[PDB]
């Protein structure tokens, strides 16, 4: 896995990532990265990347809804632990 740090300019700012679950395997996955958003401008994240944790909260067997809640909860810093096939 690897580390990605994204910073929100305001607490309600979205990262511009759509997350999905899959019927056939556990995990929270990147469906797409919105053009011009925080994640796109940072540049590292790719579609199909798996989000393993956000700010130290485990998402290996978690849900996109939990991910959204955790991303919102941070005032600014969003530390993602990510894996890529």
């Amino acid at each position: 896995s690897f580390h990605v740090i994204l910073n929100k300019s305001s607490p309600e700012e979205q990262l511009g990532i759509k997350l999905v679950r899959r019927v056939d395997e556990p995990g929270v996955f990147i469906f797409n990265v919105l053009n011009g958003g925080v994640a796109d401008r940072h540049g590292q994240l790719e579609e199909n990347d798996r989000v393993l944790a956000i700010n130290g909260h485990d998402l290996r067997f978690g849900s996109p809804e939990s991910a959204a809640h955790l991303i919102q909860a941070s005032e600014r810093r969003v530390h993602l632990v990510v894996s890529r096939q």
Partner: peptide, 4 residues
């Protein structure tokens, strides 16, 4: 999908 869930937007974050």
């Amino acid at each position: 999908v869930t937007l974050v």
